[PDB]
Amino acid sequence: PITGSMLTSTLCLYYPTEAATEINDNSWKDTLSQLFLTKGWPTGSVYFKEYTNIASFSVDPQLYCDYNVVLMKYDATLQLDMSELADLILNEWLCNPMDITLYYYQQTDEANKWISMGSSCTIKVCPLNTQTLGIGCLTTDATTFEEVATAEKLVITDVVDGVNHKLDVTTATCTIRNCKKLGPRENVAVIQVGGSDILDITADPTTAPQTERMMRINWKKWWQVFYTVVDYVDQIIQVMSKRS
Amino acid sequence: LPITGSMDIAYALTSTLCLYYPTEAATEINDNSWKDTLSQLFLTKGWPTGSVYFKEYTNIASFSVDPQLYCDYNVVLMKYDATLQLDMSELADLILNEWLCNPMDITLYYYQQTDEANKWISMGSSCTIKVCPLNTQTLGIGCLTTDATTFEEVATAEKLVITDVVDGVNHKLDVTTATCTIRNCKKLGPRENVAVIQVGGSDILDITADPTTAPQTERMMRINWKKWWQVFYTVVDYVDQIIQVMSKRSRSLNSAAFYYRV
Amino acid sequence: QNYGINLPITGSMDIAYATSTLCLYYPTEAATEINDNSWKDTLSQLFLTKGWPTGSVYFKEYTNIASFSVDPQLYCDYNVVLMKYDATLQLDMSELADLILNEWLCNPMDITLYYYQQTDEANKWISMGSSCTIKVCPLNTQTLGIGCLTTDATTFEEVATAEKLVITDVVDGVNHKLDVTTATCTIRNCKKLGPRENVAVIQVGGSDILDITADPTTAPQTERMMRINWKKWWQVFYTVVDYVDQIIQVMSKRSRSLNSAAFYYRV
Amino acid sequence: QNYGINLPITGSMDIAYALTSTLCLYYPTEAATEINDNSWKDTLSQLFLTKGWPTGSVYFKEYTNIASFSVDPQLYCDYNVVLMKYDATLQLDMSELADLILNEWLCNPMDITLYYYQQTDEANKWISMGSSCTIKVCPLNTQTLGIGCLTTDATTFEEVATAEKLVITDVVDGVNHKLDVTTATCTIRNCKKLGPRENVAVIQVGGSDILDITADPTTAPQTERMMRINWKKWWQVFYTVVDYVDQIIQVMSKRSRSLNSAAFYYRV
Amino acid sequence: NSVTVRQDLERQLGELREEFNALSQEIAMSQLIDLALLPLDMFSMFSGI
Ligand SMILES: [Ca+2]
Ligand SMILES: [Ca+2]
Ligand SMILES: [Ca+2]
Ligand SMILES: [Ca+2]
Ligand SMILES: [Ca+2]
Ligand SMILES: [Ca+2]
Ligand SMILES: [Ca+2]
Ligand SMILES: [Ca+2]
Ligand SMILES: [Ca+2]
Ligand SMILES: [Ca+2]
Ligand SMILES: [Ca+2]
Ligand SMILES: [Ca+2]
């Protein structure tokens, strides 16, 4: 209960391999470090992380920084993948293990989802009635299970709440967790390089919020993209809170 | 009549839902009992068995031919294609809104649009509408009233068209009446019975012919998708929110039609 | 002298109080599809019903967004530009929309002799021409390149290639050497003053993709930026004519400038 | 700060109130050819510096002829001084050029293949510029039928210009006209004379004072910015300009339209 | 001798009424009372139109 009266941070920039390949310069990280230094960031505070693709980045993304800015190149065929990654890295998740081989799982409320990551995650679900028998599926035979994902690097599965499910995830190359969305992760911001402003970070179908940390820029040159980010770093930082 | 309330007083199972979906959704699901499964899940959510009716349409264009929404609440899962933005917008404008329509006899009379709320809605197998504006002396402007080849074409083999011409000028129409019917429709307001869920790309529905407004009503929803099973689980799991978004029809009465009620 | 801009205006909160020209810029695609010799005459007649007297509505045709971006001209009191969405030209559409919708004050930029720097967030470098190729080399306080030798332009960091219109934004407060292809391009140092209510943009097709601010944290959608779904150019033109009242009401003709240039030039 | 309105300005009649600009000098190629010195622009720049103009503030623009210069004479400069050489056979050309560069014109487009045009006021003219303008007009009676001309046939039109680089046509006000401009090379605009342009001054270097910048035949005003000198040496002409730059600038003034208080009054 | 010249389209009646109503601002009460006292007839009403 708080009563009121009415230079020390690190920044990370996560960019695709395409940006570096186009720039085709060996010392562009050093160039951007000097430019950030002019903008007021002491040398040794700006880091540049590279990821091959959105799909590969979605496999357990680690964002160790006081501020994180993720440049995400748009693709029309990957809107769901972009939305999944954006939700995962823009919201805080409290996750617990899931052992499909041993227990049946259900989702308690709207905050509960099943987040699965790995090389290839094929998830099939069989809902069970109160008597523990598959609805439209047979527990013994997994070929009848309804398929909710297929060879996905990241999946955020939502199923009807209050009904037990038997899962048949491909745990050989995937790991699935029972996660709860605690709230927003102000440490991370996403800038969509080109596209059409398509990101649904809420599983609810009646809500597609556009928070301040979700940005979109039209682009034709990655050098222009990076110069824009450096020039308006102050605005990007002001748009997001601080935490590591 | 007046309805007087109070701003201090503390005030302290019988409806049907219809899900309209494309054929490819069922084709991908490929489970003969998927409708029964969804019925049981809706029951878990609190919808008695038989209260949910599933309707299958083959395409947006085909569904646009006289859409027949016959539930207390209707949810239309409309897939997105970047080449069908106008078609999706027309279908959304048709169903999400209430239109008072009267028949138009193009082959006899000339017609005009009274105000911004009035348009010409054409439906059928193939609507090829051509128009010719007329002046006060019934002579065509930029067209010859007798030669229909000179008319100006506003549609081409369309399953559904919502045409809007300049108000206060008579027009002569050459719509193909054999495979199409055109009606003079005045938009009354919103049809709260129906909600549209765009399962696909960006939010592009412009349900107002006014170029300055593209309002995004609460009943126009959008979801990214990769599996129809996931789409349907989303709909079932958030049915409460969708119903809260919708409301019961306030239209007093119109032409009789079949409904799926309790 | 100054129209008394320094003086105040006192208005009451209770007292009851209760030939403009219209330019229509459209692509050649529209004319080709319309395929009529007198469609301009037809639209003039139809505008006459909405109240624009004959001789007040003019129709300008441009082959492409790219070509129209080469020194666009604003001729009428109300300039409505129909822009055809193309998924591969989003940045070009954004740059053209920024240039026309916002007022700019530009100064000459002799690049063969002088280093240049952006001063504040309102300053940009606007280059226009048949082919504008821009390579920038930032300099440190010692006037040495950062990641690029000053003498050799091949080490410069490219920002635009064979572009009809470029709005370059570099880091403010750092000098740059620019190897801009001045043979077919002219680059000027511009500052954005404010909105230009004289001009409105109507995008046919697409999915509402226009950022008219260099700031990445802001993509404002003013009232003069409109979008419509389209399948017949006759339908598009009838929509514009029938709703010209709303479009004009959203616009304002006091921003009419003396010259048709999209920017104010100061030497 | 209160742009776009006209608030009365109040001042006192009994109170005592006890460089940065840029000058552009337009001259013909004949001047440079006669001077025949490569560094003459640098020399004039140094002399202007002596007079008080920081180096780099004086621009020297060269035009080949009055006729060529008349094609869109863009003068973007805090002060502009145009030395135009008198020619006995170019009096109307000189007057047209002087009017165009000495008055402010608000111009609207003209699509002569869609509309008939009438001039509604004494300040409304048709200004056409380009490689070759050939304006042929047909006045129309109230039936949209030509008067003394055939609306269908252009050869019967009455010609008011022939291969003119610049021309300012003035027809009888209030009557519709059908035009046959050669738009393939020349562009015509419906212009209205807002008022004087203080940025520009014209020095006629040669014969007598013949410029008149008013269509009205009853008046031939000779304003402050219309100067005239005799000459036999372009070096002498330029020395005179440099020496009396202060007088020229005092006769001129900063462009009212480009003042940051003209916002929403047809500039800035 | 030519094709029939189509009469120009007049105006949208809604906006015509809007402008006519907007004209009520430019009305002076005393002069309007004088004009009301003057009996307009088939001649006076249409003479100056
Ligand atoms: Ca994914
Ligand atoms: Ca099954
Ligand atoms: Ca759930
Ligand atoms: Ca025609
Ligand atoms: Ca359609
Ligand atoms: Ca209409
Ligand atoms: Ca380099
Ligand atoms: Ca460009
Ligand atoms: Ca900048
Ligand atoms: Ca001349
Ligand atoms: Ca004659
Ligand atoms: Ca005249």
CSV table of C-alpha atoms in Angstrom, one decimal, chain C residues 10 26 31 41 57 65-66 75 80 92 94-96 103 108 124 143 146 161 200-201 208 216-217 220 241 245-246 267:
chain,number,residue,atom,x,y,z
C,10,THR,CA,-11.5,35.5,-27.0
C,26,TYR,CA,-5.8,8.1,-60.2
C,31,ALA,CA,-8.7,4.7,-67.0
C,41,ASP,CA,-17.4,14.2,-68.5
C,57,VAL,CA,-13.2,19.1,-60.8
C,65,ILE,CA,2.9,5.2,-57.5
C,66,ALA,CA,6.6,5.1,-58.3
C,75,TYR,CA,-3.0,21.4,-58.0
C,80,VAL,CA,-7.8,13.3,-53.4
C,92,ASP,CA,6.8,3.4,-51.3
C,94,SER,CA,4.1,5.2,-47.0
C,95,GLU,CA,6.8,7.6,-48.3
C,96,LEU,CA,4.4,9.1,-50.9
C,103,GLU,CA,4.0,19.8,-45.1
C,108,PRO,CA,19.4,22.5,-50.9
C,124,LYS,CA,14.9,14.0,-42.8
C,143,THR,CA,35.7,13.0,-39.1
C,146,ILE,CA,32.6,4.4,-38.7
C,161,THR,CA,18.8,1.7,-54.5
C,200,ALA,CA,-6.4,13.1,-48.7
C,201,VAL,CA,-5.3,9.6,-49.6
C,208,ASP,CA,-4.4,-0.6,-43.9
C,216,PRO,CA,8.6,3.2,-35.0
C,217,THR,CA,6.4,3.5,-31.9
C,220,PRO,CA,-1.0,7.3,-36.8
C,241,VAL,CA,-18.5,11.0,-56.0
C,245,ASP,CA,-19.2,15.5,-48.9
C,246,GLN,CA,-17.7,13.4,-46.1
C,267,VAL,CA,17.9,28.5,-50.2
